[PDB]
Antibody, heavy 224, light 209 residues
Framework: QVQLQQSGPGLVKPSQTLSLTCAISGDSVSSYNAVWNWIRQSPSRGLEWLGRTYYRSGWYNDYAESVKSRITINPDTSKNQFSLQLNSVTPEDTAVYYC??????????????????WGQGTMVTVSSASTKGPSVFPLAPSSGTAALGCLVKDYFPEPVTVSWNSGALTSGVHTFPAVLQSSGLYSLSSVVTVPSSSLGTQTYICNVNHKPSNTKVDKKVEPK | DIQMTQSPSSLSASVGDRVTITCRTSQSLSSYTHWYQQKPGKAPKLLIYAASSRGSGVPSRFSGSGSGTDFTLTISSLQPEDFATYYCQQSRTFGQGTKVEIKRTVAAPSVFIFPPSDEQLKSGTASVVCLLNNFYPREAKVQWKVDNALQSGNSQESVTEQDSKDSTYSLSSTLTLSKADYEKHKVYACEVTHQGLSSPVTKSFNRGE
């Protein structure tokens, strides 16, 4: 099946340009049975379609009225990708941006405008503040279930991702939504419950990734 | 021009219940309403297309129906993993979403308290974390006491979305103090009230032990 891989910075200063890319695998950007879209989502505004590009013996573009004066969506037929450029951004443009394919699924042979596959999303924050990587501190199990965790403190912008034991440990993991502190930096915790018996034999490491600062940190969490 | 109105904006139903969500169009002649399911932290996934066709990999308990301007999405027997927001769509317009929550039995939190690490203390700040794990329903009261004095205005809470297997919530409360303030007190206590408990539960530690 098709895969859509998004990339591009998640921090844009007000008034400057947002630039994202979606790399396609398993279909052609110039396919006659595809339409390549950008859609954004924010807690307030919900899901909002921004625009599209597609090839039908020549390239076409259509854009949403709300962004039409600031937006460009361009195909790259060398790298099998398509871009989003949104100029003159304001805080109202803070959102998760998704690419998606439509116009590929058929009903009685007719290509339909359903968004059948979506990329993973890029969180874009419009802010003048600088990027900052997190500090990572252990939440140690004390003294038959034990809880342990990692405190991921003082980063900007969102998101941070956390795994445990390089993604081997998934059962009983809870990674909390980040909270914005009064400093204007984010913080979150990730916790896991495990058998207390495993503490003297199993190693537990939280793996923290903050892509906007290129921070990847591994923290061993041990008993106190 | 096309507008999409979804009802209800949210609902709670028990595992095994039949659930029905409605979408009403206006200013459209098209019957090609699509539905999406979105789970926490993930992109929306195509669930139903063209009013009634199941998307790839979609189980048979999901079905769609449509008549003039009224479209319905039905889950014939709700499962814990169907916790999600469901969106309808036509053309370039999405509905506002319906949040489907799972109603289940009461479950008391397991409570854990974590002192600040020595490493963090060196930075001049102390975070003390209280964890409430795997509880239902969402309503819970967490109070911080430092040498028995109730704390106010120096803590923040975060809550997870309902778990896709057991339908519970987990919650963290984090008390933030300067290092000097942390070092001036001994007893740090997290007191938790929840309807699953027969009386409030307190977890505490003494700084230095």
């Amino acid at each position: 099946q098709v895969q859509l891989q998004q990339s591009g910075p998640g921090l844009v200063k007000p008034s400057q340009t947002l630039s994202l890319t979606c790399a396609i695998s398993g279909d052609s950007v110039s396919s006659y049975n595809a339409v390549w879209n950008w859609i954004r989502q924010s807690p307030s505004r919900g899901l909002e379609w921004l625009g599209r590009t597609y090839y039908r013996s020549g390239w076409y573009n259509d854009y949403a009225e709300s962004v039409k004066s600031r937006i460009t969506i361009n195909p790259d037929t060398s790298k099998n990708q398509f871009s989003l450029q949104l100029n003159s951004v304001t805080p109202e443009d803070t959102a998760v941006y998704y690419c998606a394919r439509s116009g590929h699924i058929t009903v009685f042979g007719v290509n339909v405008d359903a968004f059948d596959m979506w990329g993973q999303g890029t969180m874009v924050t419009v802010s003048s503040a600088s990027t900052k990587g997190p500090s990572v501190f252990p939440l140690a199990p004390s003294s038959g279930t034990a809880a342990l965790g990692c405190l991921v403190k003082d980063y900007f912008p969102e998101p941070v991702t956390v795994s445990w034991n390089s993604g081997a440990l998934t059962s009983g993991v809870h990674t909390f939504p980040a909270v914005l502190q009064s400093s204007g930096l984010y913080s979150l915790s990730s916790v896991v419950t495990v058998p207390s018996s495993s503490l003297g034999t199993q190693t537990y490491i939280c793996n923290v990734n903050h892509k906007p600062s290129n921070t990847k940190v591994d923290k061993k969490v041990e008993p106190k | 021009d096309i507008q999409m109105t979804q009802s209800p904006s949210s609902l709670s139903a028990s595992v095994g219940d039949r659930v029905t969500i409605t979408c009403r169009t206006s200013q459209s002649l098209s019957s090609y309403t699509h539905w999406y399911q979105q789970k926490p932290g993930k992109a929306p996934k195509l669930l139903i297309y063209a009013a009634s066709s199941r998307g790839s990999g979609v189980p048979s308990r999901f079905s769609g129906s449509g008549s003039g301007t009224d479209f319905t999405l039905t889950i014939s027997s709700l499962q814990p993993e169907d916790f999600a927001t469901y969106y309808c769509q036509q053309s370039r317009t999405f509905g506002q979403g319906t949040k489907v929550e799972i109603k289940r039995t009461v479950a008391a939190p397991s409570v854990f308290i974590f002192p600040p690490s020595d490493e963090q203390l060196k930075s001049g700040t102390a975070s003390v974390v209280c964890l409430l794990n795997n509880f239902y329903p969402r309503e819970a009261k967490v109070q911080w006491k430092v040498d028995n004095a109730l704390q106010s205005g120096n803590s923040q809470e975060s809550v997870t979305e309902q778990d896709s297997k057991d339908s519970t919530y987990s919650l963290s409360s984090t008390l933030t103090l300067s290092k000097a303030d942390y070092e001036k007190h001994k007893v740090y206590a997290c007191e938790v009230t929840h309807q699953g408990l027969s009386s409030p539960v307190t977890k505490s530690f003494n700084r230095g032990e």
